[PDB]
Amino acid sequence: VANKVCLIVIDGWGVSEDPYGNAILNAQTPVMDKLCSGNWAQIEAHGLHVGLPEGLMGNSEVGHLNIGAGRVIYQDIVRINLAVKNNKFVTNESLVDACDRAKNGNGRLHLAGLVSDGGVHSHIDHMFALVKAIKELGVPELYLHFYGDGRDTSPNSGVGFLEQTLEFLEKTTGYGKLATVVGRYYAMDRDNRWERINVAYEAMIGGVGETSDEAGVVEVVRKRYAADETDEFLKPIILQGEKGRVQNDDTIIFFDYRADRMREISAAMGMSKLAHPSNLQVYGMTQYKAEFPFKSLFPPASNKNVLAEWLAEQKVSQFHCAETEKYAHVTFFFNGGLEKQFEGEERCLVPSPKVATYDLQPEMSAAGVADKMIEQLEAGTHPFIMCNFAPPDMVGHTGVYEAAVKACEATDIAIGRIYEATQKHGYSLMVTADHGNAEKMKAPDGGKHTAHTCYRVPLTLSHPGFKFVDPADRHPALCDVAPTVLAIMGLPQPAEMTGVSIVQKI
């Protein structure tokens, strides 16, 4: 190790020149006023920069995940939307596997999921992309099982998604058949009400429901609407007869990317007085349960060699410290979104104060976090140490402006104490944040702003031997923090960290 490094992650501290309701600017913050000058950077922590949809604010779990990982981890929605945009379903490994199984087997494949543009559990565009790719892959026979929404979309929008689907299958692809329509109340239960699931299950396997066809099914639904039965509660409609049922040896893909409401129906298929079809293989758009044998079209990012893992692999010990409210953020999320502790990794939990709301004690336990970090700097055992400072975010969420000011003052004090100890004991200090919050405490109306923001966050560096630079093709972002730490420490960067170091050694 060339340089020992102390990384401070402030929680909810963004960079805003807009002074109204700006608890950071208006707080006495003389330490960060100095660290955020000269050689410092401002990096992105929201939206596509951290793998979230464009325009979406950051948060603690995304932010610590990206900081710790040294790469953008793409949230399911973005990841699948990119695959659609770039025509990547046709080479998706698991889709090719599902299609090869059908082509080498009985030729029959099924798609099943929530058919709307709600985007909470699914999107109709993803189902359309799947049909196009399955057609291109040469699957002989494809059936669709349409789960009516009415919850993430309006209760009488389903007939519009049904018209879109029928027209798409008939005239755009000329391939694939609608086999079932049933409300999400039945198909997508998550409360172990198996009498609800069974309605959808028997429709899919046994054709239990109202018989219809392409010419009549929209009118069936309109009659349901007129009887005050809306999308979420549609009782089953059965098309194509027995051909369209899930039968022995069939293959099925569920295209929802939200696991909680897919666990029951997918388990019923993959593991009532009807005979259960045998030798089914089930695929999910994403992982629904690690305990399931199902392949996923978009399995979890493997997240090999996040910073904590990599330091342990290089035989470098490390320290992670937070107070209670952010302890999961510097452990579970920082380490890649799982509960794993690495060889040589020491953890430190500072108790948060026992108060009804944190605006009552806005300094929370920042002083105690600083005390523990200073102790580690004095010992010098760990070449990498990091902490989180909770107050700006947690007091920010109360909406109380003057409390947020005091939170930022207490955080600045704590940062200065750590800074002075890094200079005495030979560590370089880098200060960053996981997203903004306290720089925007008031809405334009004067009312409270209790949410995260889309502002950039600081990245500071006390070592005078390096200069900040920008990436060639994009703004710097949280994915660049761990690469930059490793460069300052003189350590190698793993290939899996596709973020870049944004310093150059002088």
Binding site: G51, L52, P53, L56, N59, S60, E61, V62, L65, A69, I73, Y74, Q75, D76, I77, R79, V120, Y257, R258, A259, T286, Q287, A290, P300, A301, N303, G336, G337, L338
Partner: peptide, 13 residues
């Protein structure tokens, strides 16, 4: 919360 990038990461805390 079950895997990095699942739906709970859209809002977090």
């Amino acid at each position: 919360x079950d895997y990095p990038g699942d739906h709970c990461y859209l809002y977090g805390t």
